[PDB]
Subunit: 113 residues, 8 copies
């Protein structure tokens, strides 16, 4: 278990060293913070758009080097989209999910893509 | 039921806030107006090309954020192409179809893609 | 000296056979049509954006084949941008300008770019 | 004169309806937030990179439609780059600058680019 | 039956009005002329590369507007590649094939893509 | 001093091993061939377009690797554009020019760009 | 059997005449040399990334001209990735594999793509 | 003052964490290695091409985030191009130059571009 930032914002400990990836991640932190402030459709739309987009871009980056962990990673992503598409308002889950995802799954592709 | 513009041209009430989308939509209004002036092959070709192109671009935009309503939207598009490919000269149908499509189906992706 | 379409909308007599160019032209016609219905800011912004975008894209297209008539063409474009930036509500001027510009200046690059 | 969000993070009141622009803005907010926590080099590099990248992309976007307010806008951007290149630790200035810049200068191009 | 140019070179009667397409077609005329001069591997390689490339690009152009005749056209292309991949030295067939293909199959997509 | 192919068409002795470059060259040969059959405007426009496009693309290619012989090369190109812009019907000049240009100036960048 | 360079580095005998391909190949020689110096995860990651990327790019190049040997070539590539993904430390195999691959399989696409 | 790798090949101590940059650097190392084996034209062309291409790409990368140290960096690059354009066979200079350039000038932009 990694610490959950408060305020729930990206910090340099999340750096992957892929600047486009890092810049997209900042948008996912932000989407989750807005929902924590107000659980509404606008905020969910914002997060869901940024998530969908980030997951696809990152997947494309993985495929460009035929990354061996692509299948498993894509599955993790798809499971989170499902959660956003069946949103129940569990912001705590989302806060945790994103921190652990970056620091354990994204961190495993560093130097391989 | 939304009002059918006369002359059958795009107005700012159709704005989606995606400038490329709006610019493509203007070409679909125009294609339908020409057919209303003269139901010939040139006019149908023009509309059919612009429709095919717009539908594909918009679909690509939807996919870039893994838009959850993609499947349903694509199906709506494909049904209209079919109509254009089996054209019977029913310009009234087309005039209605396009107004309702933009204002109810396209308007639902705003803020999500 | 060419006729002014009424309603003020693109027709196949304006085809340049550059589909990209034709599709952008359809947006300039629409832009002038809106102004002709309501001379306001939303409508002028719409024409202005489309005009600026079309003129630059067309200019790029000319540059790609090192078109001999570029400088003269670009000077024509810049003059019209200038009129839009100092709009005076002279919708008749604009209806006229566009019709002649396409049918005389743009028709000139066909087959050369 | 606009309120400063606390915590210093992007919110939907800043939406420009250009998703690319909004997503880059989220990175400038985060950049200023880091500096507000720790005024060090890692944090300033992060803000500086994101700022330089966003300003140039936004500038390109303005240029694509030959935006009339470009020169004034670019001069605003260049002044802020300059402050970052001679950073003085004035985090309050930066919090302020960004908020007003978006809500006044960037809001101005909406519908024109 | 259309006349077979002699020398076997592209002329403006083959124009499709798509400059990229026309420029690629010129390379197919050339590939067939070389083979007519000397039926060797170099010449076949040249034609086969240019054919493969042209067919794919043109197919991509067709798909961008969801051209209704794509399937039939692609099949015609694939049948010619097969011939090149099982080359028997029948230059007369190839000379005929290309003239008839452009003037009857390619000419049918004009204004639709 | 190189032989002039008859018929005036590209052959593999002109290969530069840059497939893009070779394919554009084939269009310049064809352009000169048309003029050699009929010295008219359709034919000159065709050569002129292809020439302008090829020279700029090749120039870009040179620039991408910061080619040392660029300035000299570009000056050669610009002189020939100039002859085409003041065409005098001297088809012999053109047949000659192209053959030597490729086999001397273009052959020089091989392996350096 | 072709000679194995020592030091295990790319030389001009490996030239394919496709500069992007040659530049990528240099990265595969380097990846294998590092492993020969120290069989660790960093070195394997480096080679595996460069291999995955090169194989995909080259495959894309093959497909752009509908290269007839694509299937067989892709299979050869996939078999090598498998080896890297089940790495047993047999650097000798890898040194041999790459030399023979370039000089017999890659060399067969020259002039065809 | 950094050690010179022997054999003169890239190693992970040179990583900048910009995979594109690292992969281009590997080509400069190889270029200098060839010259170190045979001081001829094929080898110098190879280094020169790769150097020109890498320096411009890296320069573009710097420009994309409006890097503060660009002008100083570009001046360093241009000096080395100049040495290659007036090659004197001083391979020791080159081995040295590259090692220090990366480890001092290039290492400086990390995290800022």
């Amino acid at each position: 278990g990694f610490p959950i930032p408060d305020p729930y914002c990206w910090d340099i400990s999340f750096r992957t060293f892929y600047t486009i990836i890092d810049d997209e991640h900042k948008t996912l932190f932000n989407g989750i913070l807005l929902l924590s402030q107000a659980d509404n459709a606008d905020h969910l739309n914002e997060l869901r758009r940024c998530t969908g987009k980030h997951f696809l871009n990152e997947q494309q980056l993985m495929q460009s080097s035929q990354y061996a962990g692509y299948a498993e990673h894509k599955k993790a992503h798809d499971d989170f989209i499902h959660k956003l598409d069946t949103w129940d308002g569990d912001v705590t889950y989302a806060k945790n999910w994103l921190v652990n995802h970056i620091k354990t799954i994204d961190f495993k592709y560093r130097g391989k893509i």
